[PDB]
Amino acid sequence: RSVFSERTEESSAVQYFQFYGYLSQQQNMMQDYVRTGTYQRAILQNHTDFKDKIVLDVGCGSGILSFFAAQAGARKIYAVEASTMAQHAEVLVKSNNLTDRIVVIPGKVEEVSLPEQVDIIISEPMGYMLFNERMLESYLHAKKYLKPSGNMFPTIGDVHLAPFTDEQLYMEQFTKANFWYQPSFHGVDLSALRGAAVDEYFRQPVVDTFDIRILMAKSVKYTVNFLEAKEGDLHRIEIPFKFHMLHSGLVHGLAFWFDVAFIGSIMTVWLSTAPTEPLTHWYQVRCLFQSPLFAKAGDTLSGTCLLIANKRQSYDISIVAQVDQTGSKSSNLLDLKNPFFRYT
Amino acid sequence: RSVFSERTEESSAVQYFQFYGYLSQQQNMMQDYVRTGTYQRAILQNHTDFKDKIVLDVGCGSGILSFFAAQAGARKIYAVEASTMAQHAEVLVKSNNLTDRIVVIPGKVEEVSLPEQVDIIISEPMGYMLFNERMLESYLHAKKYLKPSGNMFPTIGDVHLAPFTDEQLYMEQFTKANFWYQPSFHGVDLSALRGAAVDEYFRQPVVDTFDIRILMAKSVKYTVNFLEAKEGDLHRIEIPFKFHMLHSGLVHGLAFWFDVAFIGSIMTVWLSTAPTEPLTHWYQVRCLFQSPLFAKAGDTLSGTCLLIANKRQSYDISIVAQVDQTGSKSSNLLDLKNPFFRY
């Protein structure tokens, strides 16, 4: 019936918005000071983008970003939220005496109706590895309410890819899977499922952080311009890469992080999840190769990372890479919806 | 039309069986040596209950319990599993040369067609706090395939309740909710939601273990006889209690654990998750009061724990408790499906 329902299986959507109906999960994001503080600095330091303007807040949650927009002087703010958190955002609008400036519209932005066009859209549509949740498409979909020459906060998004060496992370997959490689677990030979166990572990992206010295090449950048991009552009995301190796060693996979930029009239504010920056609740994401690739400093590691959107509000990840000087090749298929949280 | 889908929300079942399709989750349960070793003990020590018998394994997962029944000499084992793990169980049956005795039948036990009535049903239908997952109802439903002389493994379940004191746990949760007491979070007044936050956080049962010295009275016991009970018996579970307090202090909530007994022909084997016993992946469960009750040694703490089954394969828990001597009353509602895994 709507753009959202046609690209999302019901069972995925139910669980998705139940998770966001918890005040504890709003709290989880709000307590990330890098996240919350940067958004407030981006909005307040570009106050001329908001003073007396009409604002749309996509996925407002508890409404905090709408309140920042009000702190900056917005005339009217339409706060759209599809989870039951919309009810709590309404309470906060009342208790903050802002009923005349913030209107909470419960529902999916693909399905609600707005009485007028807006001057700027604000949102936090970033999942881990940026693209998880497929909320960027809702953010782009919301541009049907944006005046011509309107702005968007965030304005652009950069995903970064870089090869890494982490021997222990790689070997850990087989240590876990080798549980099944025993001939008499309580009298049962489990060995026939060892290969399936290995495959299952390698299909999991690893959400945690790492020392930047494991990176073996300068990152490659893929940019989404939220002012120009269309929903369809995010269904198939092809990221070619040609890494020029700075260090010799075994490449075990690709590391992912992202930045967003709020390009305002006064200044540009950056929110970065890079491993060179303070840690956020997005952490970083690493995808292993099924087999490591040996590369010498000066060799080129080329290939593609292909993200294919699925109806579980995430992506299937296909990575293939080869060392050009030797032909050694590796690949992997990963399910971004079910990562392994490894941070301790 | 199936009994399962009538009582289960589609979205809940899809997530439920996805969780069980992962080999990492089978490994997790299997490496619980108390769980796996006790099941094998109950079956092999009662081998005569399986020798030359027809067996049904409800929710076999990777098939471990079916292999135990085969070791005990079962003639034919039908292993029903509704998750994608059924395909892995098939592989293990072939690699263990047991194709002539273990027949994997994928699907829900409420929906599959079993070729034959069985002499004994084996299963691991216990969720945390015993009742979560509502798999006990699938276990009882499967008795339509059980002979009149048949047996059930496990045969009975005992859920235990006892009041506890744990100021640390209480403050830990209340501190989290008090985030929503701030009048000026980044200049935004959140306090109007402080009441809803306390409700949400204390709606969460706490899954972890604890020292037995926090228990303030002898436990109450509610028994489910799986041989006798019907599915409908588990839609509304009413557990009254009347604790005689052995120590003075604040009662912050009620602690839960469960035992199951395998009542075989040769011996009874118990699998306990009590805090006095070695820890299992079930741990124990504690339901917090939003405000603790003060009790003196010798007072009676009475009330009712009411579990109402819901369409998300779990229960809505209602707990009312009252210090009879003072009329200090406490009532809480907890969502068993979404607990706080504190361990």
Partner: peptide, 11 residues
């Protein structure tokens, strides 16, 4: 240490 249903990681 799997995160089934946890859309956003714990901060």
């Amino acid at each position: 240490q799997n995160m089934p249903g946890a859309i956003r990681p714990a901060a």
